[PDB]
Amino acid sequence: VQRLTYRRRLSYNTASNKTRLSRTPGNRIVYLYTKKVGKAPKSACGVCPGRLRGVRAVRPKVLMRLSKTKKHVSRAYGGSMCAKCVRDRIKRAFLIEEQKIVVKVLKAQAQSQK
Amino acid sequence: AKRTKKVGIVGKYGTRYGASLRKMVKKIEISQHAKYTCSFCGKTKMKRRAVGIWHCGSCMKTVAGGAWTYNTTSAVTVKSAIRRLKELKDQ
Amino acid sequence: HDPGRGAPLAKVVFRDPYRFKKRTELFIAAEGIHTGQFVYCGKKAQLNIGNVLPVGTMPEGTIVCCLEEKPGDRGKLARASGNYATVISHNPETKKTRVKLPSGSKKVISSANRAVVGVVAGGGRIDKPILKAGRAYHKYKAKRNCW
Amino acid sequence: RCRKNTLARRKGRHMGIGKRKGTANARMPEKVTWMRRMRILRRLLRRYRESKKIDRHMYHSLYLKVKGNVFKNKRILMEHIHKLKADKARKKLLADQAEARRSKTKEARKRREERLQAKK
Amino acid sequence: PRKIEEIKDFLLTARRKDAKSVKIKKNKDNVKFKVRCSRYLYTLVITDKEKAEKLKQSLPPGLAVKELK
RNA sequence: AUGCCUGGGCAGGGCGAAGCCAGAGGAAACUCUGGUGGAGGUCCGUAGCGGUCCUGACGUGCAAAUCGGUCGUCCGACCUG
RNA sequence: GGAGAAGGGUUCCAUGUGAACAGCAGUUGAACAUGGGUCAGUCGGUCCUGAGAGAUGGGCGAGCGCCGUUCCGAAGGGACGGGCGAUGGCCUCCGUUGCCCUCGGCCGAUCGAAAGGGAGUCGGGUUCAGAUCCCCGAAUCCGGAGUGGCGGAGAUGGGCGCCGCGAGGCGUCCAGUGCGGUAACGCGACCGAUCCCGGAGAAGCCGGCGGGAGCCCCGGGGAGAGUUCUCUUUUCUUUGUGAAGGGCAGGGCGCCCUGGAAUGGGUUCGCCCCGAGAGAGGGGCCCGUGCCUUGGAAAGCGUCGCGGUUCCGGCGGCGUCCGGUGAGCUCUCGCUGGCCCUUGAAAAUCCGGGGGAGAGGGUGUAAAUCUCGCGCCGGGCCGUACCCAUAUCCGCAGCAGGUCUCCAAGGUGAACAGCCUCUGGCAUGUUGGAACAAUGUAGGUAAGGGAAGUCGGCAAGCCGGAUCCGUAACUUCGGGAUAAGGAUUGGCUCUAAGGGCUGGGUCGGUCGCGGCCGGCGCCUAGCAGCCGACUUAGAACUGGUGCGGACCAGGGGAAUCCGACUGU
Numbered sequence A: 001v002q003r004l005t006y007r008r009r010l011s012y013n014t015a016s017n018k019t020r021l022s023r024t025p026g027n028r029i030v031y032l033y034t035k036k037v038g039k040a041p042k043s044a045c046g047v048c049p050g051r052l053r054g055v056r057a058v059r060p061k062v063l064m065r066l067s068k069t070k071k072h073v074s075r076a077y078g079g080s081m082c083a084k085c086v087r088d089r090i091k092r093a094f095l096i097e098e099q100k101i102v103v104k105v106l107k108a109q110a111q112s113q114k
Numbered sequence B: 001a002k003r004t005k006k007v008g009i010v011g012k013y014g015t016r017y018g019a020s021l022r023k024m025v026k027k028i029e030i031s032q033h034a035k036y037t038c039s040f041c042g043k044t045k046m047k048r049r050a051v052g053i054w055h056c057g058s059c060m061k062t063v064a065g066g067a068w069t070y071n072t073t074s075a076v077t078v079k080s081a082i083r084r085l086k087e088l089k090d091q
Numbered sequence C: 001h002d003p004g005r006g007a008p009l010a011k012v013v014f015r016d017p018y019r020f021k022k023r024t025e026l027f028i029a030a031e032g033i034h035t036g037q038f039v040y041c042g043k044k045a046q047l048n049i050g051n052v053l054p055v056g057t058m059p060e061g062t063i064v065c066c067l068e069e070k071p072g073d074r075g076k077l078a079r080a081s082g083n084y085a086t087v088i089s090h091n092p093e094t095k096k097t098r099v100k101l102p103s104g105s106k107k108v109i110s111s112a113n114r115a116v117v118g119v120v121a122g123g124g125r126i127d128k129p130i131l132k133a134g135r136a137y138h139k140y141k142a143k144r145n146c147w
Numbered sequence D: 001r002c003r004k005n006t007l008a009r010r011k012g013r014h015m016g017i018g019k020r021k022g023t024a025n026a027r028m029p030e031k032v033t034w035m036r037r038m039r040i041l042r043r044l045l046r047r048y049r050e051s052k053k054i055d056r057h058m059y060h061s062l063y064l065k066v067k068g069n070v071f072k073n074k075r076i077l078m079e080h081i082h083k084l085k086a087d088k089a090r091k092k093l094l095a096d097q098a099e100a101r102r103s104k105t106k107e108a109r110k111r112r113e114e115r116l117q118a119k120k
Numbered sequence E: 001p002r003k004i005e006e007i008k009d010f011l012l013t014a015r016r017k018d019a020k021s022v023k024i025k026k027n028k029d030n031v032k033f034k035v036r037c038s039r040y041l042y043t044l045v046i047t048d049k050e051k052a053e054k055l056k057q058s059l060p061p062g063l064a065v066k067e068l069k
Numbered sequence F: 001a002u003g004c005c006u007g008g009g010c011a012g013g014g015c016g017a018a019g020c021c022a023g024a025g026g027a028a029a030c031u032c033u034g035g036u037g038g039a040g041g042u043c044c045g046u047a048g049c050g051g052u053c054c055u056g057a058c059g060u061g062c063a064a065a066u067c068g069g070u071c072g073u074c075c076g077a078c079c080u081g
Numbered sequence G: 001g002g003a004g005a006a007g008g009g010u011u012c013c014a015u016g017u018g019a020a021c022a023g024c025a026g027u028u029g030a031a032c033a034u035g036g037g038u039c040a041g042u043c044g045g046u047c048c049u050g051a052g053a054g055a056u057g058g059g060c061g062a063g064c065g066c067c068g069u070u071c072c073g074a075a076g077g078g079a080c081g082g083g084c085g086a087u088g089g090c091c092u093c094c095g096u097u098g099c100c101c102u103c104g105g106c107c108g109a110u111c112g113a114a115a116g117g118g119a120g121u122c123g124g125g126u127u128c129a130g131a132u133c134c135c136c137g138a139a140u141c142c143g144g145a146g147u148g149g150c151g152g153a154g155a156u157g158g159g160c161g162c163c164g165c166g167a168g169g170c171g172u173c174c175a176g177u178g179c180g181g182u183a184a185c186g187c188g189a190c191c192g193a194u195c196c197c198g199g200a201g202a203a204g205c206c207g208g209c210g211g212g213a214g215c216c217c218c219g220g221g222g223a224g225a226g227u228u229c230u231c232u233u234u235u236c237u238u239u240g241u242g243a244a245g246g247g248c249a250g251g252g253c254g255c256c257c258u259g260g261a262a263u264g265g266g267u268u269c270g271c272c273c274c275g276a277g278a279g280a281g282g283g284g285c286c287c288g289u290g291c292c293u294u295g296g297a298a299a300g301c302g303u304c305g306c307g308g309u310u311c312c313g314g315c316g317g318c319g320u321c322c323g324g325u326g327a328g329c330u331c332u333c334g335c336u337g338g339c340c341c342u343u344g345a346a347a348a349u350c351c352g353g354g355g356g357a358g359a360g361g362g363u364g365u366a367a368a369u370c371u372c373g374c375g376c377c378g379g380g381c382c383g384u385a386c387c388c389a390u391a392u393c394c395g396c397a398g399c400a401g402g403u404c405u406c407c408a409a410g411g412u413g414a415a416c417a418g419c420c421u422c423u424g425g426c427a428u429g430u431u432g433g434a435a436c437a438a439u440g441u442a443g444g445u446a447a448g449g450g451a452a453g454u455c456g457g458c459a460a461g462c463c464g465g466a467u468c469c470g471u472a473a474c475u476u477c478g479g480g481a482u483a484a485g486g487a488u489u490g491g492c493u494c495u496a497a498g499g500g501c502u503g504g505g506u507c508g509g510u511c512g513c514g515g516c517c518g519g520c521g522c523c524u525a526g527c528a529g530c531c532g533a534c535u536u537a538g539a540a541c542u543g544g545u546g547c548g549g550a551c552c553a554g555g556g557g558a559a560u561c562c563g564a565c566u567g568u
């Protein structure tokens, strides 16, 4: 059985020193240092536990190399907020504006009566 | 009483800490670990996240309540008194 | 949850009416305060739980928390875990009020300073016995080397 | 030598009381045995339900009984399912016969009422 | 490296100014043409043998088409 | 010696608490039986940590405090850079 | 055994010597004398901040200095747009600086981690000694790109009036910062500022389950091989593919659409979910470290044979294959839970979103491309050898002491226990020979008694694993408890039980054994075939009553005093 050593000078098994096994054309198992697992952006609402879809879960400095379409989705608040909370915001804004209009009309009617 | 007679949750402590202390603890230990009914969704999802803070699994609503109970009798009394004073003041 | 503090804190977002910005504040959460709740602060604020208003406006017998011992110190009195101060009587002349503190002392305070309506969230914390050296060790490790 | 010893073990040998140093749970975990049995029984129940062998309510009742470990293996569960199916078939046959008799009686009474109304 | 599905695309890639030695490897029904560029080594796999023989004569400028053996 | 920050580590087994499932009894309150569950500043025990006894060995020693057997603990008031 | 961190600093390699050291010796050495050796955009420092340290302002102090890091500060010398002035370069066009107008929160200069965060290199070959660094082959990250080096997106639409049989051409009005899907969302791009919001960075411990990989196992094919006095289709070694892209398995979703469910249903090892939309269908997204493909068989390895006195990094034939498995060990990913009077880090940096301040050419072109595919240039400075420990570190030394980590084969076995073996390592640890006296140190054995020895059962000894029975006093009802006390344990030959995958749509008609349609059987008590990991119980036979046969491996009971306990 082929026992293998670290290929760098960081002997301590830390977060930055994580490795995986890989077989080479030389027919010997070696260590490959794997990158950290990136996470997709979370919704700006702060209420939905799930993370946003349609965007690659990669490191922020790799987001710079990623293209624009991979970093968002074609929608209002796309890639920053979930569709459920987006439509909730839309309907809430519409309803609050309608209620404000109704209150303004009632206040004008009260002023006219008085 | 299927397995334990009069310990239940405090059976993990074993013979240690004293019978009276374990009996006194039992109420708080059950209350803080019991899931309450969220009065926003109606589901039994209110779980004590930490000291004095409870979280709803479904509503994702976080409520600042008691340390071991969702609502304390002192909180209920002060809420009722504040409501009464508000009504008296506003008329 | 604030380490080393029994009472939980609440982050509240206001909008500063001078610049296009959203201010954030760390209030002491009164019992019953929940997320997605509107809190109103000021002389004209309504008398509801989770609303900081001057003690002069509120009527007698009002239970408050995070009381300001002096006008403008942002709240110092009755803010530990579940403690509360009681507004006993108001004196319109000289702009002074009487407050019963959780220790039982009756203090004369200014009517200008504000207070948050309701008791502090997290009462009954001391009822549960510690039951261990370890629980006390973990409690004091987050506060200071005094256990 | 190890291959021959393993073949002897497979035939059943060197596994007596005097060659067992660990407890029964250590040698074969009861939790894993329960996992295997539950998975087998639930797979059988789901296969029957999807093959239309049992109805939804009977499937749910058998699932609850399996969780309560009424059945110690797959054969006894299969036999219990067969007994339940035979009982259901007998009860359905009797109910259908009674319903047919009642429908015939009601139809005859309705025809008699129609005849009486026509006669006036 | 990048694999090319079209012989016309392979010819366009090989016709680049920065293009260089294009080697031919006869792999016993898996014959390939590998053209080296500045960034990628573009490979084209031809199943047919007569088609590869015909493509051998399609090099415009007299490149380094020397085969691999 | 202690406080803080940032990292690493701790085989295999016994006891089987909350919670849940099924069966039986009851008029109810609910109670018994068989399972699932793996909690514990829980027990045996390895690595690790420490040093009870033989007042063993040595005692101008391997060593200005070491070695052998037997030892306490080993999921938390744990050990450590 | 193979590699590191701190520490040492030439101890690393080759040659030569045996003056001195290696408590004997030495042709030997880490000794001595000569010469050689550390090759980086990708491995780390360098950057950021944590606990913390420490200037300016201010205060104190006889004074060296101290207090303090936002506190008794006129604390940003920065930026877009506009205006003025000037030089420079085909003063066309651009850049530069000077002034003016304008805009602007930050939060303390600075230091602080070779284990925290931190973009991006892998495979083969190679030296006496260095090689993710050198050679070859494949990549990738950042910065620059004025004139912009190319293609491609903003892109070449409609209307009206004419000519032309027709395709088509001319004149004029225009729109044109993209498109598709109900939806989740997708397509190679797809203008955009001051400003604002958000995300990643960025998170505890423990348990369970599932996916993937490395290793181990078994049934075979090959190649090389030990035994063959008898048997053994024999036992032993090998039997592969990188980073970076494309596609597909395989996982997860608290994502969407049709629909509305009690006769409650779905579902896990456990949980859990549902009229705030469950089952059932159709879709969508993330990781895809795994399989196929470019890389890539050219190279590597196992064999057979040659060229070459010698140098020679050579030349060639073949193989590098087909399957199943497991609470199996390790690593990683993903769900799910339990615990906290513990809630389990900051900053550098990057990205997304709300807005349209502003730009564009006007009908063939342009401003822009958070740049879509290519093409060009550069990446500076420091460490890179070795030891990393019964001889390269610290203990006065080649000292039985101490010193932070990674890799973890087979058998027995619960086991990372002890014992034996494979890869790898070594000469038994500052010396050898000859006898086996007394004292000793470390192991054992002893007829009969069994603590009568001794201050004291000091020491030794007894029991010890597993399976099946049984288990008292007391009690805080949790325990005591493996209480106490009993039986079995080997070998060989059998029996029973605990499972997966596939298969009937058979008859007729029709089309090319395969496909479609119709009524049939609808196994709805399931049968037939094929595979596979271990167990549990029982039965007989048998060995000189021996069987947890080595190893591992609890002595119990009745009480008193003290301390609750765990811990120190």
Ligand SMILES: [Zn+2]
Binding pocket: A043, A045, A046, A047, A048, A082, A084, A085
């Ligand atoms: Zn949301």
Ligand SMILES: [Zn+2]
Binding pocket: B038, B039, B040, B041, B042, B043, B045, B056, B057, B058, B059, B060, B061
């Ligand atoms: Zn709720």
